[PDB]
């Protein structure tokens, strides 16, 4: 048959995840895209990101170790 019995353990939490358990990244690579300001200014994209709040947004990736802050570049 295609009928399957489940067993559940419900006596106590086995772990506690963060409220931000499901988090997301933006790849460091995207900061080198000329349209970086257009892209992340998008009100549609902010609406989508708000849906996954609360969450961490990690900015990183291979390019992390090939990016230098320049306070003059404006």
């Amino acid at each position: 048959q295609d009928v399957v019995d489940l067993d559940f353990f419900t006596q106590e939490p086995l772990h506690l995840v963060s409220p931000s358990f499901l988090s997301v990244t933006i790849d460091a690579n995207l900061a080198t895209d000329p349209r970086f300001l257009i892209l992340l200014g998008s009100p549609k994209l902010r609406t989508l990101a708000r849906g996954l709040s609360p969450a961490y947004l990690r900015f990183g990736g291979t390019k992390t170790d090939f990016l230098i802050f320049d306070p003059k570049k404006e």
């Binding site: 295609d2 009928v3 399957v4 019995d5 489940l6 067993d7 559940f8 353990f9 419900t10 006596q11 106590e12 939490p13 086995l14 772990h15 506690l16 995840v17 963060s18 931000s20 358990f21 499901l22 988090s23 997301v24 990244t25 933006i26 790849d27 460091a28 995207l30 900061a31 895209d33 300001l37 992340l40 200014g41 009100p43 549609k44 994209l45 902010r46 609406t47 989508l48 990101a49 708000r50 849906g51 996954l52 709040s53 961490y56 947004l57 990690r58 900015f59 990183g60 990736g61 291979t62 390019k63 992390t64 170790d65 090939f66 990016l67 230098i68 802050f69 320049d70 306070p71 570049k73």
Partner: protein, 385 residues
């Protein structure tokens, strides 16, 4: 191949305002390959960025380096885990002297724990483990260039994740017992993702299973590569359209709570019917304290019917079944929730996520090659209050 690039105050502002306006907590990866004469980390660029972020009152968390296990291949520079821990101790001193004294520090963002990576992680946690808030590591199942449709549906590929998690916890328990462990960057396939796979309904089996296993096995936070970007593994494409994994992520967020429980299928054989159980998310207005959220993956090519155990057999269950919108089947970029296509109402409004109430006592139907959430109403589980 990788060349140095610069980023401006403008870029930092774009990124922070995106996160602040979105209710997201920004973690910023600092450059670890800026080295003094004797391969010490040179903190001078990071000092310029900390001061600028402080001067704007930006509440930012930090990391230092990405996949240091690969720095030899990427930059012909070898930094051992000892030296990296020392570099983290120096970043910790800079944060403690900054305007945000309690700012958090995560690392070391190692790749999945092969022998040399596990050795680097151990020596890192011996040296610098006292100053990190959580241990970060990365996981991808497949190379995007060679991955097949079959790979995305194969329980033997899904199961490899279990041995990576166990190996990371073996290193952490041997060095910094109790330290939280995060997946700092994860997805289906590296090399930018598998074309026509990593951005489709088919990608959801790996994503939901990874969330289910990570939660069950003790991982506190999972960071999805990527929310937005060039790679096929994006949640949102460059035309700002959400992909199936976005809608799966949104449902997970709304329904799945912080308290992790366990489900298993009788007759064992945990291969193609994968089941996970948490308390329901207390922020979901629809549900109440004590409710359960079951989520399940069916990788069989036939429908399976799940029977809930006593004392949950006769409870009202709300079904949230995701199926692709045709004609592209599992390779579709569109998804239906209980037969309704998921689409934004407009640029400012996510749709409501409408449940299907099942007949109480009915078995939970899970079609072939599908995944579903099930909320058990009035479950009255004391663990979940």
């Amino acid at each position: 191949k990788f060349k140095n690039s610069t980023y401006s105050r403008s870029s930092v502002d774009v990124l922070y305002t995106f996160a602040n306006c979105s209710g997201l907590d920004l973690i910023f990866g600092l450059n670890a390959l800026l080295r003094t004469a004797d391969l010490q980390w040179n903190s001078s660029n990071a000092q310029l960025l900390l001061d600028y972020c402080s001067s704007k009152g930006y509440n930012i968390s930090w990391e230092l380096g990405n996949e240091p296990n690969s720095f030899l291949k990427k930059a012909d520079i070898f930094i051992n885990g000892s030296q990296l821990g020392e570099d983290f101790i120096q970043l910790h001193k800079l944060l403690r002297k900054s305007t945000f004294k309690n700012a958090k520090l995560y690392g070391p963002d190692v790749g999945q724990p092969r022998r040399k990576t596990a050795k680097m992680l151990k020596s890192f946690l011996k040296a610098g483990g006292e100053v990190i808030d959580s241990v970060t590591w990365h996981h991808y199942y497949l190379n995007g260039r060679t991955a097949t449709r079959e790979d995305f549906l194969n329980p033997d590929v899904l199961d490899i994740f279990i041995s990576s998690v166990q190996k990371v916890f073996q290193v952490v328990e041997s060095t910094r017992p109790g330290k939280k462990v995060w997946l700092g960057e994860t997805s289906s396939a590296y090399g930018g993702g598998a074309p026509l796979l990593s951005d489709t309904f088919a990608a959801g089996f790996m994503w939901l299973d990874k969330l289910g296993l990570s939660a069950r096995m003790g991982i506190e936070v999972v960071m999805r590569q990527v929310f937005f970007g060039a790679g096929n593994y994006h949640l949102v494409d460059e035309n700002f359209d959400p992909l199936p994994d976005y809608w799966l992520s949104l449902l997970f967020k709304k329904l799945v709570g912080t308290k992790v429980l366990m489900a298993s299928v009788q007759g064992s054989k945990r291969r193609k019917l994968r089941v996970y159980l948490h308390c329901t998310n207390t922020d979901n207005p629809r549900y109440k304290e004590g409710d359960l959220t079951l989520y399940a993956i069916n990788l069989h090519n036939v429908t399976k019917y799940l029977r809930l155990p006593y004392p949950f057999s006769n409870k009202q269950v709300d079904k949230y079944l995701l199926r692709p919108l045709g004609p592209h089947g599992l390779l579709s970029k569109s998804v239906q929730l209980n037969g309704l296509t998921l689409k934004m109402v407009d640029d400012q409004t996510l749709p409501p996520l409408m449940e299907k109430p099942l007949r109480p006592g009915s078995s939970l139907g899970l079609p072939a090659f599908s995944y579903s959430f099930f909320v058990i109403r009035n479950a009255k589980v004391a663990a979940c209050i």
